[model samples]
Target chain A: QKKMKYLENLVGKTPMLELIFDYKGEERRIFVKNESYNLTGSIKDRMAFYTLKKAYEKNEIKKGAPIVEATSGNTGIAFSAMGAILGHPVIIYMPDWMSEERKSLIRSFGAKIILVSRKEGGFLGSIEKTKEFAKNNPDTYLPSQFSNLYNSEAHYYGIGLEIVNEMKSLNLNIDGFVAGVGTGGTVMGIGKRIKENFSNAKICPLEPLNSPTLSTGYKVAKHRIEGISNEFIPDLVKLDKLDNVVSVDDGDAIVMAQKLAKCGLGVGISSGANFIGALMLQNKLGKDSVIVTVFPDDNKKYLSTDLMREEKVKEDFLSKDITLKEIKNVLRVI
Target chain B: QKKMKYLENLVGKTPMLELIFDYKGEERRIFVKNESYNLTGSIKDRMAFYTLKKAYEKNEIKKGAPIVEATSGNTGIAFSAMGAILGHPVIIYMPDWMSEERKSLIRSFGAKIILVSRKEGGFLGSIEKTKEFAKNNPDTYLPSQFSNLYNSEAHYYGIGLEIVNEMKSLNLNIDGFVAGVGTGGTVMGIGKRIKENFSNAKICPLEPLNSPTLSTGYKVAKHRIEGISNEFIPDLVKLDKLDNVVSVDDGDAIVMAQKLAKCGLGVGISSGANFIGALMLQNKLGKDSVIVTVFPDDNKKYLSTDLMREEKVKEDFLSKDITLKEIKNVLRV
Candidate 1:
């Protein structure tokens, strides 16, 4: 409890909302586990906590040691914030291409940021720099979350346990668990937990359709999904445990994210992609198959990203009576 | 309950954490009632819910009636989002000088935005426009939250009750209740509830030091504290009920807001002003007093405001070893 108080008591147990909507001229339900309620407004807070906690227990991280991590956005923000609260100096290495809001937020917690340029290394380059910096600096704890088993273990006990408990309390049958393949921590860890109990549950992984790294076994090009599909498959992602891969294009995912907002849920693009993945799983498994997905974070961080492009104004469902009716119908079902 | 399902159960009952800090070499504790968890990330969601609920019950607002409001920022965003969920066309009239992020957010909800320029009438001008538009249209419902009793009533039952219940459970004695006079709904309502149970509790109102409308009974000049001190005193602010009036400057408030962020709590400028006001109350009341203040919103919306000006950066506390030790000691103690 003392350590928990230092961390601001911000970790797991987010809301699991039953989002019912009209799909393919039929009624469908998807339970969206919103992770925005956590500290720094991301599920990465769980990973940051467990990774640091495990390291601390193993004597890898001490009181005076500087914590370091190579993160694209959410993980950086989480680690920086958590580091500040727990009285540890932090250095975050991230690609310079991410949103300025994220960078400012990370810096706001008084963490040192080392921006890796595309020419220098982009995300992978940032990782290389992080590795080198950690090797050179003794007593610096580098939480390489992409390969850290603690990242997955965090979700297994944190988010995955909550989903199962919430569903069991509501007497709801979960047939599928859907999540985006960011570090694959969420899917792998939560999938393991759910599968340990509900053996028949489908563990589905979501990624950008443009990249299709998990679905097609190839990284075609750069995509707009911020947190997931970082060019290469992460070590924490257990490929054999995955039941299916669902891909959401930037346009479709952005539209769905806006739709979620219109439906009174403010979620990010990857959450929208995960929602699409849940829908894909529902369509395949047919009726009475309850699919659960994670709305990883909020859309407030993506105001400057492709998620809010001027061309995407048509995604605003409140502008049209038909779409408003669709939202109303969905609300009625809820 | 059925209708609340669509609206995403996100209003009220925010965390009330005891924030202990060293103020002028004294150990002071302030419980921050964080409203960043609310829908649209502001305390206005409670007012929006109750205002709309009351209007709907009285047949003033229907599914077809266009909900119209003249707001500074958070209220418009809240109404637009709530109106969308409840199936109503919303028209938000705000000052054109407000942040682009706010305007973009309101527009994102598919609401019709009418930006009123400062040269024309500013905030009051937006209100006049809203009234005229609502009068012209028979089906338009104007939620003038400043004067609406439901606004105060919302906080009375929602936030006020939550505070009382939470305090009772913890067996903590609340000696002071502090808040900013935005619409005056927060102070008027939450104050009334806390006072009813604990009559000895002091209810304090906060305003910008530059424009001490409640404290001085005069609006002197412009101030950077948004969502409060709107050139004139609002009708919802019951000044007689207030035990004290505390003021905070833009620089102090902004710096404290940054401090709050660094301390793992992201709060807006007015929230920082209220924090300073709470500190003032705590100093006067001395030890053995528990003070509570509402952090009405997050700072994400104020990135473009004077709250985030580059020149305002002190770089004093975090950059210095003394302050790091201070923060570390604060954390340890």
Candidate 2:
């Protein structure tokens, strides 16, 4: 039990990076929380850990009980690894089309993964499968991350606290916070805290241009970016709850991730989109404006996926004209 | 240039994890520096950073100059990433037999890899190739880590300082420190500093049971554990510099890593060996003895390696009597 407490301590408090680069003869800067340093190497760890913690406090789940959830990728990794250590038998229902590395990563935590094929409903079907298991077991604690408000709270108290604390310490206020809408947990949760503190700070929600879930109010098309742009707008993310929508193309995200990897960042595809989104927002707000975002996960999970492949460079890509000059540690581990 | 200094900050200062587990009904404690949290998710980053820093100060290399080195795996990954950040054109000479993940990771950092074929002498040949490249380019800075004391000093001032500081803060003087000998940078470097602070600390060098490079004074056999037992005794590893030699089987190391992965510790095969070696030494010194080691790198570098595969369980393995009962982080991040 004490181990669980110690394990929970590992979920957050990640260092934030200040990425300074040149774009169109102007130097643009963005601060990104290096969420890859978290327990399971993602921001999802915050929500997964928080949801499980609240569930335990509320007596919603017993120790060593089976935990069920559906994930695009990182959330399953978070819950599966956390569940393994916290005495829970985790069963993750994820779409089969996700990265093979993601599947293996979930399995590495000794959790069972029930792959949901596209014909069997894909992402939405995976959610259905998780609820089906929960109903039969009755004792199963299902963390429906897409709809769970605790997912937002995880960022409110955890990620938001760190970002705010670091920002306060630095004696600076950011123009806005940007993020790709995965379960909308990151944007909505972190957005509330930022807006509450820095009134003028815009809460920008990022989406894949291919699958404009936030733009079209539904998933427009299939996208290669695995974690973000789920088929439907997650319950946690409402248009009224956010400011602006920024979209990055799937291929643009892939190669931007490649460039960032060469800069020794090792971020995922969603991270590339988040950075591009943050950069575009910085361009909109002002080149000198301080915009913050998160590198949702690491490159390790995408070694076998499309992120490692040779992607074509499109002319309309936001990352096309910019060169990554350098990255600095603005907030380091204390 | 200022970014290089900020980039250097990412190299070390990793949180040490105190792995609390049960061994034969008694509590066994081992502190492992989670080096996976470092720049390239490996302890070699410390040495790589230190080596480059000293070279730059001594005018051994210019800014954006070509940096060269040969590696078993982690060292190259370290140099590759650090070089990319520090404006160096890095060329890593590695054996073709190493894991594909290692090769890809090196490439990801925009470093050129010169793969040395086994027929042309393998690991030894890789080193030979680096020297040849260095000879041709007079300005090239080649950090021959095996012979460089800075590699060991990187551990001495950096890792050892952190360990000593953490121990002092917690008011606990550890009994020994265990580590797998790759470039001997870890056991000797951290070993020297730990022994300096904790007078009674024993520096135990871990090697593969199949390849007793240190005990036998030569590379006796080929083993699966990469990064350690590098076919011969490195210049940095001297028997007199260490206290005891604890050996773990390659297969045993693999399964132990698998078990640790189940506990959410994504460590490599050598890390598995280091933990098992520490456990064995703790057993030798009695279960009450406190030991410290390191998880040299993360599992991301080893997923494609034998670490992800199924292996046979040997009855004679030291890990047979132990179940990883529970892994509690006592000294957490």
Candidate 3:
């Protein structure tokens, strides 16, 4: 707090955008907390900074101690940027299968990246490697996001407070709060705070429908939606606090995300999964319900992934013979 | 204004970030106006929204008239987003040499894109085709940003006023105002406003050092820096209202941009050129001078371009056989 003023100031205050959609002949409105507008371009920036700052405040981290985090998602990118600015060496360990954009972004901040292979070890292997490195190096502090209490605490006072405060100013009631489970930090932190005030509001946690980690208490198989259910439930996720556990398929999530992009949102697939969950809640609750969901990240990183395929665009909207004029007409919102 | 409220609100009021650099012995400060934070990820959002609003106000654009424009830069992306939100069919024409990222970004906003070949016609051919489309289609509105007065006017009261007013509240004198020349709209519009109040401030325009259009008075073949040096000088560029013209090389600009990214700025090459020009002005004017420059766009679109070369990274501070500790020490401030 005394030193890292510029880095600390870059965290919260993301924009809340109104997402309109036709649900069972009713115009359902889902207020999306667009976390992509944050300084590091993701909601994980909140948790990353919070975790680091808390560690610093507690004397858990020395002045020049390096930061070691095992993440292939937005957390790594966030840590890289904040760590660099605060004058700490940031080292990230991730599976090699992650997108080149993610790698490039982390590297762009001058961070050291160690890529763990799927054959030798995948995500869990990378986590083990990070633990090993932190064990060996006394100067490095590993703020493991999955186990860290400050991870959710970041969202509790950060995003959760902002949403309730902003919605109060707008004179709107938050009937439901939805988010996809990543580190469970966002869902738990935000969901708990939202539950405190809006007690009647449903706090739903979304997982990949194909995997069904939280619903069945076990991972069935690998799903396409990144940054969500890996192999096991995270420690930070307060399963008892959750009202309902929702599941979203990869294809439906992709299509809905594309639809969000068509609607000028351009959110990631996990955001789409959260949006689908929000839609399901809307359908269950009926009309005149204001649901707030966090679109955790942007779609730019997923361009090289399966997100940019013609099949994803085609299956979502039009036929093979569709012309430019017809496409324009279909996209035209009046 | 009442009709296009949602789309109009997306433009202007970008944040001004202080850029600190090592100068001789003392620290040099250059306030960079980061336009990358705009709605469509560029400064052109201001021009795009302003142009559309002005046209809509004059009844020049019908209720649902197709908005046609020739642009390959941030202007197209801005128009695509604004037009889609405003419920207008937006059509963009650009050179085929442009990146797929640019095309996809415009397409993401549901805008129709027409790619023109360099052989048939490059940017000029695209412009010609845009004009032809306007002539053929009765309901088409062409807001030619290169020649439009509203383009400059967007910045004059928007970014320009914001910069001067913010600086006044901070109790600082803007000794030099620097910007790169694209459609000449940004420099002319923002530069004109700053000059009105801080009349003694030096307003400098930047160009690619290799081509040096503004500096040399002639374009030398081509340059790697996009959105700055075109085939011809823009009509909006007022040559008389300048203190001096500065130039930066394609390689130097690219390297400087990567340096900015290392510093967490992540701006584009044209922005790098503008930064280099600002540094030159800072060097000449001494440590006391306060220079302000515009980082027009971000570096995400240039990942496929020269911005993402291993050679650029290799030639930077990192050595050939650099270890993890060594690399960290090299990147250390």
Candidate 4:
């Protein structure tokens, strides 16, 4: 009989499919490392799982600590689920105006939710509350995904490695790595790994054009990519690993998401944003050139988003109505 | 320089994951192979692809000949999407009762659709119109999913082999295989493989309780799993491979689907029915058994039905208010 293995079912190898498509009207092929197929419906599950797993190994918190976090949605759901499975009590501070499905999805993971007033700065306001909780509850491990390298490492060890392995099997040379960056954790981790393989391969960080944090030299604003848009340069983020930064319009992300669903990919809004970023890089390169991107999360959260509605699509997509602010408290000028 | 690949982009390797709970309130483990993740969001995409691919290889239909199909939703969408991608024409004969999303999705896939009215009879009426289309349309190759062994064989090659490979990697042994029988295709293929591996493994077929085709011991009926019902036994369906048949109520299927969605699965109504069957078999055995089931299609097709809206869920879930006769008529019983 095979020896009993240490079960870590939360994270594993994800599938990458090569999609044959038009890149700026040119015939080329690009691979989409489908991360939405992850058990918790997002790549965040990997980070959240490892964060809790590593924390437990170090004895930072007991089996059940009252964990608190501020999130747009994805991290909360992933943390709630991983925390629940690992026997940790979790409380999430979310913007009051966040999607009902996102809230419901978090609740579905059996976590106590704390809703903050959107009038008080929406998601960023809640981040302040998370900081408050971490200080007050001292026992609470605020997984501060934005500044946590664990979030990037999750994708690095899991998604980043998986993409390289799959590429090797198919006899394709991966030329570059491109991914959406709200925290820049995914890009930093994956970029580091991809650079290690093909030292000269470029690593591009993608963000919503409205919330062009890295591309606009770390500008701060609220954008439609829910899990993205950071007001400060995260401490855990590796800016040096980034070769360049590309900003994708929220409209283009929605269109790409619709395209993904039509192409039988059916990813979430953030994934739509990421898909456009990846496709943009592919359009500039040749068919043989490789650009891997993350299909961030499931679109179930955005069933009621402007993209889901037929009539509201044009208005919701093309409009630059996302909340934005002047970069007064710029964390880094890199 | 690395060798360039040719056909790698045509198909995607869908993920296989384990279902956490047992339907029978037992501590049983079940695996749900979500085929809804496939291109066009159904298992039929694989069959439709292989069918057209085979026909294309044989030069049975000329380059310009359209791939025509009689489908409720899935097969039509698959064929249309394949046509759009491969630069071929596709035509579909569907019953008028199909959902709007199905029509929209099929149209989006670049298929020319013809809706047949079930005014006089029911499903059979649509089938009759389909046969007429087959006779008149010379360029059309109708790969009938019911009688065609290749259709079942596609699952044997696609879902069956894929699942076994996954289980082998995980080092898990299967004890039973259960799936909702729309055409008896998925269960026959996957079940055959499962039985061959474990010998005593049960191959269970689940049908709607109202339209009990296999479970009722009735040889012929119009069952509501859509694209999988038959008034005549399918030549490709190996009945002897099935160890048992369980009729699932629509209400149970609906509730389970709601439960699955609540549990972050978000499977379709047909999957709810399929899950109930798998869970029940696990409960009866009273062992730490490994069961496998398939989520055939997407939930978008059922959004217009009573399944999506909470207010209409009761009305749309099962054949509750209707009599057995109405069900038989609707199912072509």
Candidate with the greatest DockQ versus the true structure: 2
Error of 4 at B259 (Å): 4.8
Using DockQ as the yardstick, the better of models 1 and 2 is: 2
User: Residue B301 error for model 1, in Å?
Assistant: 1.7
Q: Which lDDT tens digits does candidate 4 get at residues A1-334?
A: 0100122343445556656664434555566665654446678777787777666667777645777888878788878766764557788988876676677666655577888885776667888888888888777887888777777787778778877777777676778777777677788888878888878777887777887777666676666676765555566666665767767777767766666654445567777777666656755665567877777765556665655654234543421222111111101000
Model 2 stretches astray by more than 4 angstroms = A1-5, B1-5
> Rank by lDDT, descending?
2, 1, 3, 4
- For candidate 4, write residues B275-303 as lDDT tens digits: 77776677666457877788776454565
Candidate 4 docking band: incorrect
Interface RMSD of each: 6.7, 2.2, 10.1, 16.7
> Worst lDDT window (10 residues) for model 2 chain A?
A1-10
Candidates 1 onward: DockQ, in order: 0.37, 0.54, 0.29, 0.10
Return the top candidate by lDDT. Answer: 2
Q: Cα miss at B174, model 2 (Å)?
A: 0.8
- The single-chain TM-score for chain B of candidate 3 is 0.90
In terms of lDDT, the poorest run of 10 residues in model 1 chain B is B324-333
- Which residue pairs clash in candidate 3? B209-B248
What is the TM-score of each predicted model, taking all chains together?
0.92, 0.96, 0.91, 0.74
Error at B324, model 1, angstroms: 8.9
Per-model clash counts, in order, read 0, 0, 1, 2
